[PDB]
A paper describes a structure:
Cystatins are inhibitors specifically controlling the activity of cysteine proteases. The cystatin superfamily shares a common fold that is characterized by a 5-stranded antiparallel β-sheet that is enwrapping a central α-helix. Because of its strict specificity for cleaving after asparagine residues, it is synonymously referred to as the asparaginyl-endopeptidase (AEP)2 (15, 16). This strict preference is exploited by the legumain-inhibitory cystatins C, E, and F, which use a conserved Asn39 residue, localized on a reactive center loop different from the papain-inhibitory site to specifically bind to the legumain active site. Cystatin E is the most potent physiologic legumain inhibitor, binding 100-fold more tightly as compared with cystatin C. Thereby, it is associated with a tumor suppressor function in prostate cancer, melanoma, and oral carcinoma cells.
From a structural perspective, the hCE dimer was assembled from two hCE monomer conformers that are connected via their L1 loops. Analysis with PDBePISA and PDBsum revealed that the hCE dimer interface is built up by 45 hydrogen bonds, 361 nonbonded contacts, and two charge-driven interactions. This results in a buried surface area of the dimer interface of 6710 Å2 and an interface area of ∼3354 Å2. Furthermore, the free energy of complex dissociation, ΔGdiss, of 55.4 kcal/m indicates that the dimer is thermodynamically stable. Remarkably, we discovered the assembly of two hCE dimers to a tetramer. Nevertheless, the overall assembly (nearly parallel β2-β3 strands) is similar between stefin B, cystatin C, and cystatin E and therefore suggests a conserved mechanism of oligomerization. The dimers interact via hydrophobic contacts involving residues of the former L1 loops. Despite this large structural rearrangement, the local conformations of the legumain RCL and LEL were virtually identical in monomeric and dimeric hCE structures. The crystal structure of dimeric hCE uncovered two symmetric and functional legumain-binding sites, either of which is accessible for legumain binding. Upon dimerization, the L1 loop, which is essential for binding to the papain S1′ site, was incorporated into the newly formed βII-βIII sheet. Thus, loop L1 is not available for binding anymore, and the papain-inhibitory site is destroyed by the dimer interface.
Residue numbers in the entry:
A (entry chain B): 10 to 76, 83 to 126
B (entry chain A): 10 to 76, 80 to 125
Write the structure that this text describes.
């Protein structure tokens, strides 16, 4: 992790990263219409390192609703509590306070 | 990009990453209830290097609708008039050369006039 070098909007790798950013946004979007890149204003790149963690973990539903301390929310009880087996992929860089969830894949289990 | 080493479910850094993962899923999830971690089965860690790109860019709505995917935005003309919408977005993209793909990490898009 170093400080970002400024780049040319026309840099071919910048353009590759732009196209990727658009594609993922459109997959994410809540618009029916696809979106397209017009102009690229500011482009910067940083060099980065981090650890990627690969978790397989079981999670249970608590009773608390979303509209925060999860320790104080006790799990649901019996057939009412739904359990999940999830494979997570988390990325931690030393600079960020945050860590990012990259891929997650969850599946329900039987009683 | 290196090999995953298996680690202890109780490793404090593993615990911090589980905590992070849960929070992220909870914001993402389509459940009404928050979820909580019970048991940690398998934990592995991999070392990673790549470049992060920080784009600020303007995007327009095209006429192509949604009803990976097989899209050439080159073939999709921007909208005219009623369907017009312009966005100014700050993206953060991560590219690792070992992997082929790139990942969008943070995006913040804002409508324009």
């Amino acid at each position: 992790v170093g400080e970002l070098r400024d780049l040319s909007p026309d840099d071919p790798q910048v353009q590759k990263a732009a196209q990727a950013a658009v594609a993922s946004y459109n997959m994410g979007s809540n618009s029916i219409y696809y979106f397209r890149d017009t102009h690229i204003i500011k482009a910067q790149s940083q060099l980065v390192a981090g650890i990627k963690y690969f978790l397989t973990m079981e999670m249970g539903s608590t009773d608390c609703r979303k509209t925060v301390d999860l320790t104080t929310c006790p799990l649901a009880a019996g057939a009412q509590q739904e359990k999940l087996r999830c494979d997570f992929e988390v990325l931690v860089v030393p600079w960020q306070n945050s860590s990012q969830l990259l891929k997650h894949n969850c599946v329900q289990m039987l009683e």
